[PDB]
Symmetry: C2
C-alpha cells in the first residue's frame, strides 16, 4: 500500500526526452509511410502505361503484364533473402518480438530492404498490404533515432519502438486511433508489465498522421457513404455472422501457416529458387491484375463496390474464393508485405455475401447488405489476428458509420469467441512463436 501511494502520486510523468523524440519518430515514420505509398502507386501506374503500349496484341499484352510484375517481385524477394531475412512476411510479428527483447531491430538493413523490397511486391500488384511493412519500417525508424541520440533505458527502447510501429499503422490507414489501439491490444508485451508511455505513442501517432494529411488529404482510402441504421431486432443476425467468421478464422490461420511450409519445400531455403518462385507468384498477380483485377492487388478498390451491393452473389463467391488463394500464395511465400489489409477485403466480401442472404430471408427487417459488409470488414481480423477492438475502431475510422457500432462490436466479439472455442490462435503470436522456437530448434 505504501508503495502504491507513492506510485499514484508519480503517475503520468514521462521523461521529456522520450516525449520530444517521440515527435520526431512519428514525423519520420509518416514521411516514410507517405513515400512508400506514393512509390507503390507509381509502379502500379507504370505497369498500366506499359499495358497500353501493347493494348493490341493480347498475348504480348498478357506477357508484359506477367514480366513487369515478375521482375518487380523478384527484386523484392531478393532484397529480403540477401540482406534482411527478418523483413519477410508482415513485419508485425518481428517488431512484436523486439518488444519482448527477443528479436533484433537491424534498422540499417531492414529499412532499405523493406522499403524497396515492399515497393516491388506491392507495386507489382501482389496481394499484400502496407500495414505490416510500414509497421516494421516504423519500429526500425523508432529504433534508429534511439541509437543515433543514444537514449538509454528500457522505457525509451520500448516506447520509441512502440510509437514508431503505431505511427506506422496510423499513416498506412489514416487511422490515428486504430494505430494507438493496436499497440495496446496486440503489439505490446502481452504477458508482463511494460514501461510503454501511452502519451508518447500518442504524440508520434499525431505527427505521422499529420504527415499523411499533408500529402493525401481530400481523398479517403475507402468511401462508403452513410448507410442505414441497425434495429435492435436485427442484431442477432450479426452474432450469427460473427460465429461464421469465428469458425473460418482458425481454418484460414491453419492455411497461412501450412502454406508457409508447402511453399518452403519448393525452394528448400535456396535464394535462387525462392526468388524464381517469387517472380512466378508476382507474375501471376500482375496477370490476374489485368484479367480479373478483383482477384489481385490490395483489394481496397472492391470494398466500396461490395458495400454498395453492386457485385452479384456469384461474383462475390468467386472473388472470395480467388482471394483466399491469392492471399495465401503471396503472404505465405515470405514476400515482404502484410496480410492485415487483404483481410479487410476478405471480410468485406464475406460480409456482403451474408447480407445478400439476409436481405431476401427477412424483408421485414428492411435490410441493406452493405451493413453486413461493414460488420464483417474487421471480422476476419477479429477471428484470425484476434485484435477485435483494433479492427472495429479501424473499420470505424475508415468507414465513418458509427450507427453500426453495435453490429460491428457484436460481429467482432462473435468472431473472437468462436475462434477461441474452436482452438485457433492469434496469427501474429502464432508466427512469432514459429520463428522464436525455430531459433532455439
Amino acid at each position: 500500500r505504501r508503495q502504491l501511494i507513492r506510485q499514484l502520486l508519480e503517475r503520468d510523468k514521462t521523461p521529456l526526452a522520450i516525449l520530444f523524440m517521440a515527435a520526431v519518430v512519428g514525423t519520420l515514420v509518416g514521411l516514410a509511410a507517405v513515400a512508400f505509398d506514393k512509390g507503390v502507386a507509381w509502379l502500379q501506374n507504370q505497369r498500366m502505361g506499359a499495358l497500353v503500349h501493347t493494348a493490341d496484341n493480347y498475348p504480348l499484352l498478357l506477357t508484359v503484364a506477367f514480366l513487369c510484375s515478375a521482375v518487380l517481385a523478384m527484386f523484392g524477394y531478393f532484397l529480403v533473402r540477401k540482406y534482411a531475412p527478418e523483413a519477410g512476411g508482415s513485419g508485425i510479428p518481428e517488431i512484436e518480438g523486439a518488444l519482448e527483447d527477443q528479436r533484433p531491430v537491424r534498422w540499417w538493413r531492414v529499412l532499405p530492404v523493406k522499403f524497396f523490397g515492399g515497393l516491388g511486391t506491392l507495386g507489382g500488384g501482389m496481394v499484400l498490404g502496407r500495414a505490416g511493412p510500414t509497421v516494421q519500417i516504423g519500429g526500425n525508424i523508432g529504433r534508429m533515432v534511439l541509437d543515433i541520440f543514444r537514449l538509454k533505458g528500457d522505457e525509451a527502447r520500448h516506447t520509441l519502438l512502440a510509437t514508431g510501429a503505431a505511427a506506422g499503422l496510423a499513416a498506412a490507414f489514416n487511422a490515428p486511433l486504430a494505430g494507438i489501439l493496436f499497440i495496446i491490444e496486440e503489439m505490446r508485451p502481452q504477458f508482463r508489465y511494460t514501461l510503454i508511455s501511452i502519451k508518447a505513442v500518442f504524440i508520434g501517432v499525431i505527427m505521422s498522421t499529420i504527415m499523411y494529411r499533408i500529402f493525401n488529404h481530400e481523398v479517403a482510402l475507402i468511401d462508403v457513404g452513410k448507410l442505414s441504421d441497425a434495429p435492435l431486432n436485427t442484431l442477432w443476425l450479426y452474432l450469427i455472422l460473427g460465429i461464421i467468421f469465428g469458425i473460418f478464422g482458425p481454418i484460414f490461420n491453419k492455411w497461412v501457416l501450412g502454406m508457409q511450409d508447402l511453399l518452403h519445400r519448393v525452394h528448400g531455403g535456396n535464394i535462387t529458387k525462392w526468388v524464381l518462385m517469387g517472380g512466378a507468384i508476382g507474375g501471376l498477380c500482375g496477370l490476374l491484375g489485368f484479367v480479373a483485377p478483383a482477384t489481385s492487388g490490395g483489394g481496397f478498390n472492391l470494398i466500396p463496390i461490395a458495400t454498395a451491393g453492386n457485385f452479384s452473389m456469384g461474383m462475390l463467391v468467386f472473388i472470395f474464393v480467388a482471394r483466399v488463394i491469392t492471399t495465401l500464395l503471396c503472404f505465405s511465400s515470405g514476400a515482404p508485405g502484410g496480410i492485415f489489409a487483404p483481410m479487410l477485403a476478405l471480410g468485406t466480401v464475406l460480409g456482403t455475401a451474408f447480407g445478400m442472404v439476409a436481405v431476401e430471408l427477412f424483408p421485414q427487417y428492411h435490410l441493406e447488405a452493405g451493413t453486413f459488409a461493414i460488420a464483417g470488414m474487421g471480422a476476419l481480423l477479429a477471428a484470425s489476428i484476434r485484435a477485435p477492438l483494433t479492427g472495429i475502431i479501424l473499420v470505424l475510422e475508415m468507414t465513418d458509420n458509427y450507427q453500426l457500432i453495435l453490429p460491428m462490436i457484436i460481429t467482432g466479439l462473435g468472431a473472437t469467441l468462436l475462434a477461441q472455442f474452436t482452438g485457433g490462435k492469434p496469427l501474429y503470436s502464432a508466427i512469432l512463436a514459429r520463428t522464436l522456437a525455430k531459433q532455439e530448434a
Copy 2:
C-alpha cells in the same frame, strides 16, 4: 525466458468460459441498473418541475419549494452515505480503482442501495453531479456481487468481473461502449503492474449493458450536435493552443477540488448532522439555481448542444463557465454521491466554444465555426484534470459523431495532458485514491 514466451504465446487469448458467461450477466444487470438510475433521476427532477408550477405565481413561495425539494432530496443522499456507506461518497471511480489494486473493499450489500438511492437524491435534486461515477461504482459492486454469489475463485475472475462491471457501467451512462472499454484499459486498471483482466470479457459485459440501454433509450441521443464543418490543416495550430490553455487550467482545477474538500470538511468536521445539513444547504442552492439560472446547475448536458451551435453570447459563456466552476466544486468536493466526470464535459464545451468565438473573429480567413472548438474542448478538461485523453476523445467522438474533427480533438487533448504534466498536475482519480489510501494508514 524465450522458452516461456513461446509457451505463453501459443496459449494467448483463452479466457475461462465461466468468466466469459458471467461477464454477460454482469453487463446485463449493470445495464438495467444504469437505466433504472437514469429513469429515477429524471422522474424526480420532473416532479420538482411540477411542484414549481403548482406555485408558479407566488415567486417567493416558488423560490422556496425549489430550494426545499432539492434540500430534502440532497440530505437524504448525504445521509444514506454518511450512515451506511461512507465509501459511496464522491465519484466512486477512485474507490473501484482501489478495489482493483486490492486496496479497497467492495461492500456491495451496502454500496448498491446507498449509491443508487443516495445518488438518486443528489442527482434528482438537481445538483451538479454526473451519472458516470455512480454507475461505475454501482457496476463494479454488481460485478463483485455475482462473483460472491456464484463463488468464482481466482484473481482473474475477481479483477475481470470487477472491471467489466465498471466498464459496462460507464458505457450505459453515456451510450458509449467503446469509451467504456477504453476507460478500463487507460485509467481504471492497475497502473503499475501486470494484471489478469480479460479484455474479451470486458467486451461482452459492455455489449450487454449497452444493448440494455438501447432497449430503453433508443431514438434519442444524449447530445445531438449535428455534422459540423471540417478542419483545415492550416487551422490545426489553433487547437494545440487550446490544449495548452486546458493544460494549465487542468491542474489548477484539480487543486481546487482537492482543496475545497478540505475547506468543506471543516464546516461539519466529520459530523453526520452538520454534513447532512450542509448538504441540504448546497442541494437547495442548486434547486434554486435550477430555476433562476438553470445553466449554472444540473448535469449540463442541455447546454452542450446550445454552446456548440454558438447560440450563447460571449458574456453568457463566461458567466456559465465561472458559475459552473463554483457549483461543480461545491457539489463534488462536498462528498455527495455523484461524479465530476460528466460535468467536466460541459465545462470543457463552454471553454472550447469561448475560444472558438475569439478564433472566428481573429481569423476570418480560416472560415471558422466556434462549434468545432467546443467539440475539441469537450473532452479536454478530462484530458487535463482526469488525465485520460484517449478515453475522453473516444467518448466525445461516440457522443458527437463528428469524426472529421478527430485530429483537432486528438491535438487539443494531447496538448492538455502535456501541459498538465509539465505544470505539475496529477490525475484526479489517482490523487484522490492516494488521499484516501494514505489517510487510511495515517490514522495509525
